[PDB]
Ligand binder design. Sequence first.
Ligand SMILES: CC(C)=CCC/C(C)=C/CC/C(C)=C/CC/C(C)=C/COP(=O)(O)OP(=O)(O)O
Lengths: 192, 276, 327
Amino acid sequence: MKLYSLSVLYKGEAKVVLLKAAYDVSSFSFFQRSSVQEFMTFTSQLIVERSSKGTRASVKEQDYLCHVYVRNDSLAGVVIADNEYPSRVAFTLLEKVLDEFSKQVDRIDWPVGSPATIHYPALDGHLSRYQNPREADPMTKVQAELDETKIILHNTMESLLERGEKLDDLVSKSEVLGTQSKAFYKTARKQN
Amino acid sequence: EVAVLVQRVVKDITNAFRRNPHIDEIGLIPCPEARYNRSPIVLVENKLGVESWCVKFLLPYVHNKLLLYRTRKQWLNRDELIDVTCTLLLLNPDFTTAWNVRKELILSGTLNPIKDLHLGKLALTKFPKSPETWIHRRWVLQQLIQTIPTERAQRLIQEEMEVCGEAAGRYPSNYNAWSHRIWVLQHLAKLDVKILLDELSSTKHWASMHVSDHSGFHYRQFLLKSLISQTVEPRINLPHLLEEEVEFSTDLIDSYPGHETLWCHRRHIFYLQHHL
Amino acid sequence: QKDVIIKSDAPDTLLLEKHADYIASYGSKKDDYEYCMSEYLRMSGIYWGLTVMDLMGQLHRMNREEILAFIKSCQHECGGISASIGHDPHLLYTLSAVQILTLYDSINVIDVNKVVEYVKGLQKEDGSFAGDIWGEIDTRFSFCAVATLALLGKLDAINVEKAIEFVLSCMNFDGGFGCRPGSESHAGQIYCCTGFLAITSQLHQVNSDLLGWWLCERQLPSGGLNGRPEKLPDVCYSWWVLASLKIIGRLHWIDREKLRNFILACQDEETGGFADRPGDMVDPFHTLFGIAGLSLLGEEQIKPVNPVFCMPEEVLQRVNVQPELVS
Ligand SMILES: CC(C)=CCC/C(C)=C/CC/C(C)=C/CC/C(C)=C/COP(=O)(O)OP(=O)(O)O
C-alpha cells in the first residue's frame, strides 16, 4: 500500500506538458531516488502521450501500477502506485485533484505552463494523505459514477507503443531523463 | 596502478566508519568512469555510497586476497583481516567463507561481536534477502548468549525486530527476514508472553499496509500459535485475540479484495480456533 | 492477483540446441567480477550446468577432467567439500560435488569415507543437521545429508530414525514444511523434506491430499508456479513444486499444458537458457529447473529426471539409488 507519483499534466496537439507533480521515493535505495523519480516523470508523460482524451487507463508493470485519467478537456492526471493500492481509490484521488486544479489555475495557463510557473502546493499534501486509503475522505459523489468497466488495462507499457516502436530509443532520446538515468537504464537493459 | 588505487578504497571505507558510526545504509552510485583524485567512496549524511566504476576492480582484489589467506599463500594482520572482510561483505554478503573468518576473529577475542551485528545490518540495506547474512547473524547472537530474559537481551531483541522489519519492507514477502525474526523470539525471547503481545501490536499497522505479504501474516500466526502454547488474567484473552484477528482480516478482505494472502491468513486463524 | 501475462510472440517451442550452446559457452568470456560474485556457490553452479547438459544428452561437451581435478582440490582435511578452491567446506557443496562425481562415475576421485565422516558429524541430538561446523540448522541440510549418503550407499552411518523425527517436527498444519520447526511453509523446503522422507522411506507420514492441495494452490492463471501464496511465478519453483507433487504422488493434479507454456515462455530465442520469468536474465540455475520441469511433464526430447535427486534416471539406475515414490 504505497503511492509513488502524483503529477498533473496537459495534452496539447504539439506536446504534452507537465504542470505540477509530487513524489515519494523514500522507499527506494538512497543513491537511486534521483534516477527513479525521473523515470516516474518520464512514464507519467509517456502514458498521456499514448492515451486519448476522455478515457481512463491503467498501465501495469511488475510490482508497479500507473493510473491515468484524461478528461474531455486535455487536462490529465497520473498516479503511480504498487499492485496493492486499489484502482478505485487511485482514480478517486485523481478526480478531486483535477477539480481543485481547475479551480485555482486558468485554462490558458495550461498549454504553456511549467512547474516553476504553476501554483499548487497541495499536491505533496494529498500524496502523503492518500498513502493509506483507510485515511481517505469517503467521497460518494465521485466514485458512484466513475467506473464504466471500460478502463483499458495494459500488461506492459509496450502495449501503448507502435508495432515498430522501441522503448530503448525512447529512453535514450528523452529530454526528461538525465545522462546518469539513461546509463542507469542501460544497467537495467541487462535485465537487472 | 590498481594495486594502490584499490588498497586505498579499503582505507576510505574503514575511515568512513570511524568518522561516522551512525551510517544508515549503503548503496551503489552510477559511475561509468572515475573522476580526478576523488575516492569512489562518497558519503552524504548517514548514507555510504560506492561508485560503480571501482567495483569491478575492488571486489576481485579483496576476494582473491581473502582466498590467499585461507590457503596460507599470503599472511594478513588481524587488523587487515577485519578491513578486507568488511569491504568484501559489503559488496557480496553471500560469501560464506568471509563470514566464517569473522566468526574465527570473534571467537579468538580479536573482533567485537557488536561490529558484526552492525556490519550485517548495513549489508541488509542493499541485500535484505541475503540468506548468509541472516545465517551468520544467528551465530553472532548465539555467542552473545552463553523466567524473563535480562535487560541486555531485551535490548538486543528490540534491535533484531527493527532490522527484520526494515528488511521486510525493502523486499516484498522476505521469507529469510521473517524466518529470522521468528528464530529470535524462539531462542532469544524464549517465547516471552509479554514480547509476543507487543509484537502482535506493533505489526498490526504494518500488516495492514502490506496485504500481499504472506510471510508477514505468518509471523502473526506464529505469535498466536506461540501464545496458545505458553498459556498451557492476561492469559484469559485467548479466544478474544483470535476473534480480533478474524475481524482484522475480514476488515481488510472487505477493503482489499483479491488477496489470497489475506484469505490464507483467515483460513489458518479458523484452524487455531477450532483446535483449542 | 500478481502474475505474468504470456505474450503471443513468446516462445512456444523447445529450443534444445540453443540451450546446450548457452551452457557450453557459459564462462567462456573471462569476467573476474562475476566469477568472484558467484564463486561462493560455484560447485552447485557446475552441478546445474552438467546435469542440464546430461539431460539434453550433451554432457560430453563439458570439460570432464578439468572439473574432476577441481573437485579433488575442493575436499578439505575434515572430508567436507567446499564450493570452490580456498572456500570453506559446506554440506551443500559436498552434495553438489558428489552429484557431479556420480554423473561422471568418478566417485573415488575424493575420499568417500571422509565425506561420510563429515556428514555424520553434522547431525545433532534431535536428529537435525547443520550446514557446517558453525551449527546452522535447516531441513535443507537434512535432505543434503541423506541425499549425499544415499549416493555413497552409507545412509546407515547416521541416526536415520532420529533424523526422520526432526523433519516430521517441521511439518506445519497446512501440510507443508519449513526450514525449522515453526517456519512458514515453503515449496523449496517441502521439496527437501519430501525428498528426505522419500530416501528414508517415510512417505506414509505425509498427507498426500493435504500437501498436494497446498502445492497445487501455487499454480497461477498464467500457468506458472510460485513457492508460497501471492508470489510471482518462477521457473525454479516449477521444479520444487512439481518434484514434490511427483514424490507424494499428486503430479496428475497439475495443469501440464499451461505450465509447460509458461516454462517455454521463459526461453531466450537468441542467447538461450531460461529466466525466472519471461523477458528476464537467463542463468544456468533456472536453465536446469526449467529443463528438469519440462522433463517431469513428459518432454520426450529430454531424459527422464529423478524428482528426488534432480538427476537423470539413467544415472541413478546405474548406482542403484531410486527411492520408492507414492503410486
Ligand atoms: C538437488 C537440488 C535441486 C537441491 C539441493 C538441496 C537444496 C539446496 C535445496 C534448496 C531449495 C530451497 C529450500 C529453497 C528455499 C530457500 C529460501 C528460503 C529462499 C528465499 O525464499 P523467498 O523469500 O521466497 O525468495 P524467492 O521468492 O526468490 O525464492
